[PDB]
Amino acid sequence: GSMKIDVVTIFPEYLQPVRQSLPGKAIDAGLVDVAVHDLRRWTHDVHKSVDDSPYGGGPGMVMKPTVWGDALDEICTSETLLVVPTPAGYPFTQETAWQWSTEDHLVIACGRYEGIDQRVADDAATRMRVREVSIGDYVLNGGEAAALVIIEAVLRLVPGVLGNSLLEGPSYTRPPSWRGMDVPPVLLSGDHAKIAAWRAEQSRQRTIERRPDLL
Amino acid sequence: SMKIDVVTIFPEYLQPVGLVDVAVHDLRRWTHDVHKSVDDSPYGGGPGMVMKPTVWGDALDEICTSETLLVVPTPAGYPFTQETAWQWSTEDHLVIACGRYEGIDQRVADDAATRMRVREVSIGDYVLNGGEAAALVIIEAVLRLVPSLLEGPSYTRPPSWRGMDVPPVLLSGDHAKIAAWRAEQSRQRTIERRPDLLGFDS
Ligand SMILES: N#Cc1c(-c2ccc3ccn(Cc4ccc(CN5CCOCC5)cc4)c3c2)n[nH]c1N
Numbered sequence: 001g002s003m004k005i006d007v008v009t010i011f012p013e014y015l016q017p018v019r020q021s022l023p024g025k026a027i028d029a030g031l032v033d034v035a036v037h038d039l040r041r042w043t044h045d046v047h048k049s050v051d052d053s054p055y056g057g058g059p060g061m062v063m064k065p066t067v068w069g070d071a072l073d074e075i076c077t078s079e080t081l082l083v084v085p086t087p088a089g090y091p092f093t094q095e096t097a098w099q100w101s102t103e104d105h106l107v108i109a110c111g112r113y114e115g116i117d118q119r120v121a122d123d124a125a126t127r128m129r130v131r132e133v134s135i136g137d138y139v140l141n142g143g144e145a146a147a148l149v150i151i152e153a154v155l156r157l158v159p160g161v162l163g164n165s166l167l168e169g170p171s172y173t174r175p176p177s178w179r180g181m182d183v184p185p186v187l188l189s190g191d192h193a194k195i196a197a198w199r200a201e202q203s204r205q206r207t208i209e210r211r212p213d214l215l
Numbered sequence: 216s217m218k219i220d221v222v223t224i225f226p227e228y229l230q231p232v233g234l235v236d237v238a239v240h241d242l243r244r245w246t247h248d249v250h251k252s253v254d255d256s257p258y259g260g261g262p263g264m265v266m267k268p269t270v271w272g273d274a275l276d277e278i279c280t281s282e283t284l285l286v287v288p289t290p291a292g293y294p295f296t297q298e299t300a301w302q303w304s305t306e307d308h309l310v311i312a313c314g315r316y317e318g319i320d321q322r323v324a325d326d327a328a329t330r331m332r333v334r335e336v337s338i339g340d341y342v343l344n345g346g347e348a349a350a351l352v353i354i355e356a357v358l359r360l361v362p363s364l365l366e367g368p369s370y371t372r373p374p375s376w377r378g379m380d381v382p383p384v385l386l387s388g389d390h391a392k393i394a395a396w397r398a399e400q401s402r403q404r405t406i407e408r409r410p411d412l413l414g415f416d417s
Pocket residue numbers: 059060084085086087089110111112113114115116133134135136137138139140141142143146366
């Protein structure tokens with residue numbers, strides 16, 4: 001019904017698409033509020049450091065636990081669901097989105113470099129729900145794009161917020177003939193049992209060809 | 216070296232973004248009557264509107280060549296994975312067609328598949344409102360590659376924090392023992408979160 005979302009990142013500008021797809025009606029009606037915070041507001045040094053060399057060697061830097069611990073303490077309560085995009089996470093699916101759609105406070109912690117010191121989430125887990133998730137089997141530069149996906153998948157399940165087993169088959173609209181390609185005639189037959197069956201066969205077929213693992 | 220064109224009725228979403236340029240094009244600049252919609256009701260009936268192939272056809276005609284790789288995000292596409300990103304990292308020209316509503320008339324990709332290579336892909340098993348978020352993900356996964364197991368936990372300073380210690384092996388400086396500990400963490404994490412990567416059931 002109602003939901004607050006805090007996003008924490010060192011590139012707040014990458015979250016612009018969210019401000020751009022949120023309807024004013026939902027914000028006015030207080031269905032949703034989305035804040036973005038610059039992690040660097042919680043650094044301790046004049047150089048505004050967020051990253052440091054990894055214990056045990058290895059390429060790339062790791063984000064500092066001290067800075068992240070500062071930010072999460074301020075933003076989180078014991079009622080928060082802390083969401084941490086990560087290339088080593090549990091799969092984010094539609095089931096996940098559905099379950100999170102009923103939460104009242106999401107915090108999304110977007111890391112960069114090789115990620116965030118593990119102690120941050122371990123510590124968080126001793127007093128709030130914490131979920132390490134990945135949005136798909138590919139590698140990104142950080143968690144900001146993942147957050148865009150997660151926020152969208154979830155918010156569109158919250159009634160009136162974004163204004164909206166087998167693979168879906170093909171869709172068709174006007175004109176009935178275009179570049180020598182006619183809309184499949186069954187779709188114009190006015191026989192709605194035949195149409196439903198024809199769509200089901202397309203669906204089964206496409207699913208076999210594209211996602212045989214759903215079977 | 217690579218060029219990416221994204222075509223969308225929501226160009227303001229793509230807002231933020233040398234050997235590579237990325238152009239965002241407004242599909243509506245191609246409409247035939249400014250007083251008409253890009254979407255219409257679906258043949259056969261159903262919920263939601265479908266995007267007409269007419270406007271899409273004019274846009275892609277202009278923007279594509281026969282060598283163009285045309286990418287269409289769809290919730291019914293082939294899985295987009297790291298293998299896909301690697302394959303696309305060598306292309307010279309990608310055009311990403313972002314749909315909205317219930318999506319694009321199927322004849323667009325079917326007609327395009329007669330003159331160029333078309334790829335219907337999905338970035339995940341979850342539902343979006345249109346192809347634009349997917350295009351961002353796809354662009355990010357592909358560009359970072361232009362010239363097995365899940366990773367375990369990483370740590371940096373301080374060595375103790377809120378009374379949590381860094382795993383002492385990592386302070387040992389024994390490269391072989393550290394490698395071993397990390398493989399162990401990674402296998403453990405993989406079995407727990409993604410058992411399918413090792414051929415088990417989910
Ligand atoms: N959700 C989600 C994601 C993410 C994601 C999410 C969050 C962060 C924070 C930093 N990064 C970058 C990053 C990339 C790769 C690696 C590991 N490799 C690097 C080199 O050495 C070892 C192997 C680590 C860190 C992130 C990536 N990617 N793909 C998804 N589906």
